[PDB]
Amino acid sequence: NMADYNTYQSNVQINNLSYGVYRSGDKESQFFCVGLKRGSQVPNVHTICKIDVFGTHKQGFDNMLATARYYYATGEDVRIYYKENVWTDRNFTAAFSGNELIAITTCTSSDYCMGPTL
């Protein structure tokens, strides 16, 4: 299996977006977070973030932001891959979450979506 691709939520929509700049530790950072819904429900893990100078995978900040904003704009069904309990800044996690955004793929029906499944 593809490392860090075993945790995901399928057929969700990105219905909120946060983008901001923020100092954490000794690093000046950028971050964004997606807020998730699944139809009228709010999924268990519903806030996922990516930070430019922190994380399991620091590459792809701009591309991941553009991708998320695009799906925010369309409101289409997606699968979000993420990694839990990454962020150590307790102020950041309380306001948002500890989840790191790993990947986003598109969905054509219930439980297909592009990408690896368990």
- 67 belongs to an annotated ligand binding site: no
Q: What are phi and psi of 44, to 5 degrees?
A: -50, -55
CA dihedral over 44, 75, 79, 52, signed as positive or negative: negative
Q: Say which DSSP state 38 is in.
A: B
Separation of alpha carbons 18 and 35, rounded Å: 8
Considering only residues 68 through 87, tell me which ones interact with Ca ion, judged by CB under 5 A. Answer: 74
Q: Which residues bind its own copies (CB under 8 A)?
A: 1-5, 15-23, 28-30, 33, 35, 47, 52, 56-60, 62-67, 69-70, 72-73, 81, 91-92, 94-96, 102-108, 114-116
When asked if residue 117 is in the footprint of Ca ion (CB under 5 A), the reply is: no
- 107 belongs to an annotated ligand binding site: yes
Which parts are annotated binding residues for Ca(2+)? Answer: 74, 107
